[PDB]
Amino acid sequence: DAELLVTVRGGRLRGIRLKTPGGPVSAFLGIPFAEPPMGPRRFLPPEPKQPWSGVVDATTFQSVCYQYVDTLYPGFEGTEMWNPNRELSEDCLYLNVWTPYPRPTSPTPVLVWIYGGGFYSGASSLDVYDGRFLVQAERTVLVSMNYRVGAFGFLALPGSREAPGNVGLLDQRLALQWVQENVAAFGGDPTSVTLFGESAGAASVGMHLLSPPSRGLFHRAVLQSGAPNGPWATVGMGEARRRATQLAHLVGCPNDTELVACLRTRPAQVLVNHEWHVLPQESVFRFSFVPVVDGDFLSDTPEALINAGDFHGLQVLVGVVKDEGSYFLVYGAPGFSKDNESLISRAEFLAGVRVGVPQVSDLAAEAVVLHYTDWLHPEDPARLREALSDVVGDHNVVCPVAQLAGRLAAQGARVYAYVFEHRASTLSWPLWMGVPHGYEIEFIFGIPLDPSRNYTAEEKIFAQRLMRYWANFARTGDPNEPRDPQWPPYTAGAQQYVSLDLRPLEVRRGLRAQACAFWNRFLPKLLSAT
Amino acid sequence: TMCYSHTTTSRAILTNCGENSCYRKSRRHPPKMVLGRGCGCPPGDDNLEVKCCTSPDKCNY
Numbered sequence: 001d002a003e004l005l006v007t008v009r010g011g012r013l014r015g016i017r018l019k020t021p022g023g024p025v026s027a028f029l030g031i032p033f034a035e036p037p038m039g040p041r042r043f044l045p046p047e048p049k050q051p052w053s054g055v056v057d058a059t060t061f062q063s064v065c066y067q068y069v070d071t072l073y074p075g076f077e078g079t080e081m082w083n084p085n086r087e088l089s090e091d092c093l094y095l096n097v098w099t100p101y102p103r104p105t106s107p108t109p110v111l112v113w114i115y116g117g118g119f120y121s122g123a124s125s126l127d128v129y130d131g132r133f134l135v136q137a138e139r140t141v142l143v144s145m146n147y148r149v150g151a152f153g154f155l156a157l158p159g160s161r162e163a164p165g166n167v168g169l170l171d172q173r174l175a176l177q178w179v180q181e182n183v184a185a186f187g188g189d190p191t192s193v194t195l196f197g198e199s200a201g202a203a204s205v206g207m208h209l210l211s212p213p214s215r216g217l218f219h220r221a222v223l224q225s226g227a228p229n230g231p232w233a234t235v236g237m238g239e240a241r242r243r244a245t246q247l248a249h250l251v252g253c254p255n256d257t258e259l260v261a262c263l264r265t266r267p268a269q270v271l272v273n274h275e276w277h278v279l280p281q282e283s284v285f286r287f288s289f290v291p292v293v294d295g296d297f298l299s300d301t302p303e304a305l306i307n308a309g310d311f312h313g314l315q316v317l318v319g320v321v322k323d324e325g326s327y328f329l330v331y332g333a334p335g336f337s338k339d340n341e342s343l344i345s346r347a348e349f350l351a352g353v354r355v356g357v358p359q360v361s362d363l364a365a366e367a368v369v370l371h372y373t374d375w376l377h378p379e380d381p382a383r384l385r386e387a388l389s390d391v392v393g394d395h396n397v398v399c400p401v402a403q404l405a406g407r408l409a410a411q412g413a414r415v416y417a418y419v420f421e422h423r424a425s426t427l428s429w430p431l432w433m434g435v436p437h438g439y440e441i442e443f444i445f446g447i448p449l450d451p452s453r454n455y456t457a458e459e460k461i462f463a464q465r466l467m468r469y470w471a472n473f474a475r476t477g478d479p480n481e482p483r484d485p486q487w488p489p490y491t492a493g494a495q496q497y498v499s500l501d502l503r504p505l506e507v508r509r510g511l512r513a514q515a516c517a518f519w520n521r522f523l524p525k526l527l528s529a530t
Numbered sequence: 531t532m533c534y535s536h537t538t539t540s541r542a543i544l545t546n547c548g549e550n551s552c553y554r555k556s557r558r559h560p561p562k563m564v565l566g567r568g569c570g571c572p573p574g575d576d577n578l579e580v581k582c583c584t585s586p587d588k589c590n591y
């Protein structure tokens with residue numbers, strides 16, 4: 001087709017058409033948007049791709065950004081589905097465009113995907129991130145980029161030009177700029193761009209809301225299971241300098257210029273080998289190189305910006321899965337494994353609290369134990385398992401998200417909030433984990449419509465129902481299917497949200513309201529005094 | 531013996547360690563990320579925990 005041929009500012013591309021149950025879609029995979037950040041460019045902000053002669057093969061996905069590969073459970077789908085599915089390279093700055101067939105005539109609203117993976121991992125080519133069903137079912141344009149992770153993306157020596165930090169967020173921003181100047185070529189409207197992301201991806205989205213040079217690049221935000229003000233999401237200049245300096249000692253590196261010049265000579269693998277060493281304490285849901293608060297990309301801490309900010313003109317969609325915490329516990333909490341039901345003792349519970357809430361006084365830990373113990377059933381193993389799941393999930397996800405949603409809604413933004421309560425029938429993680437971190441994604445992209453996968457019929461319907469909610473938000477800033485159950489905005493007072501499962505929309509109140517008061521109001525007062 | 535094999539940046543494959551032992555390198559303290567699996571029995575450290583074994587197959591999991 002002449003529809004698989006498109007010209008962008010830098011040259012010509014050759015796409016591929018993709019089959020789906022509802023009809024074909026045109027795909028353009030692995031378009032370069034930056035000069036490859038190797039050699040003397042490692043650690044630097046990205047430079048725009050220079051114009052090319054000829055036709056770029058955009059039929060297949062490009063290299064995954066150099067990263068650690070999670071090998072907790074060899075051969076297990078639950079962990080491997082998140083692993084790199086293409087060879088690793090430092091030359092990894094490529095993006096992907098999905099557009100309807102035939103190409104729309106009126107400019108259609110654009111959806112941009114930013115993946116998560118704790119800023120240490122992730123890739124735009126993972127199966128669970130397939131643009132094809134969403135573009136076919138709702139006729140929007142879908143874009144997704146690769147951005148640098150781990151040390152390559154987030155190692156900072158704050159104040160230096162050789163390693164300023166945050167360069168993976170700058171990768172995201174360069175791709176957004178590319179969208180402004182090229183998305184018309186595919187039928188997309190640059191005046192209607194909605195950012196969406198999960199986990200670190202959602203944290204990323206939130207940081208674009210708080211960094212003015214990004215505000216001209218999009219109009220709406222969806223944050224799934226993540227928030228910039230999460231305790232894992234940012235790090236200070238002090239810590240970031242300590243962590244990068246530790247790493248340089250491990251790989252043998254003697255002046256900030258000399259230090260990075262030395263670092264740039266080390267093979268990528270030698271750097272990944274040492275990434276996990278630099279983590280300060282014992283913890284789950286903590287990662288070595290994350291965005292730094294340096295005064296540049298963020299002019300202050302995410303919390304101070306959220307509190308001060310003006311958000312009139314904004315529509316934001318926020319949400320969380322039913323069991324945010326459970327996935328992470330098997331990474332070190334005593335008694336937890338995916339290979340049994342992890343019916344822990346109370347002694348394990350108390351030890352696990354110290355792990356899922358790093359860096360706090362002994363007093364603060366007793367406060368957590370206080371709030372999360374059922375004193376009618378202080379020793380019941382199943383309940384102690386669910387409770388530590390909640391501790392980790394609340395601290396890291398539900399309560400940062402809830403606080404963000406309340407501050408935005410009170411300061412201009414129009415906010416809609418959900419809890420995703422459906423456990424996928426194909427889920428490979430055990431049942432005690434429930435609906436874990438990142439398991440709403442496969443439905444948002446409508447992966448159940450894929451024939452070669454074993455989803456039920458009600459789930460196919462559910463997925464299409466969800467794709468409609470997300471597409472309605474991108475077009476209008478309102479997920480509501482006009483007209484006739486309705487999804488109300490979230491406000492700080494009434495705190496209304498909706499459950500997303502096979503049953504119809506149900507409206508509830510308070511996103512874990514009692515817990516969030518402990519984490520957001522009381523705990524800070526305690527630590528500020530002890 | 532048939533044991534798993536991989537680095538920090540490669541997927542886990544099966545290999546024939548034979549009469550040697552196996553190992554599972556991991557971060558000692560949480561998060562206990564696996565950093566390696568292979569043949570032999572190498573020293574660990576403060577941050578690196580090594581677990582050795584001899585049998586049966588796939589024992590370094």
Ligand SMILES: *[C@@H]1O[C@H](CO[C@@H]2O[C@@H](C)[C@@H](O)[C@@H](O)[C@@H]2O)[C@@H](O[C@@H]2O[C@H](CO)[C@@H](O[C@@H]3O[C@H](CO)[C@@H](O)[C@H](O)[C@@H]3O)[C@H](O)[C@H]2NC(C)=O)[C@H](O)[C@H]1NC(C)=O
Nearest residue numbers: 330331332333334335336337338339340341342343344591
């Ligand atoms: C549910 O699973 C957890 C994790 O165990 C893991 O899964 C099992 C199926 C086995 O394959 C285990 O090898 C695997 O680690 C069990 O918790 C673990 O229990 C064992 C003892 O039963 C602990 O080992 C001890 O460690 C202490 C020191 O901490 C030593 O003094 C002892 O000599 C002994 O080696 C192990 O630490 C622990 N794993 C951790 C750290 O989480 C749990 O027992 C199991 N529940 C069941 C059987 O229903």
Ligand SMILES: *[C@@H]1O[C@H](CO)[C@@H](O)[C@H](O)[C@H]1NC(C)=O
Nearest residue numbers: 077426450451452453454455
């Ligand atoms: C679907 O289920 C069948 C059961 O026999 C299995 O053979 C096949 O591999 C499954 N496909 C998946 C997991 O997508």
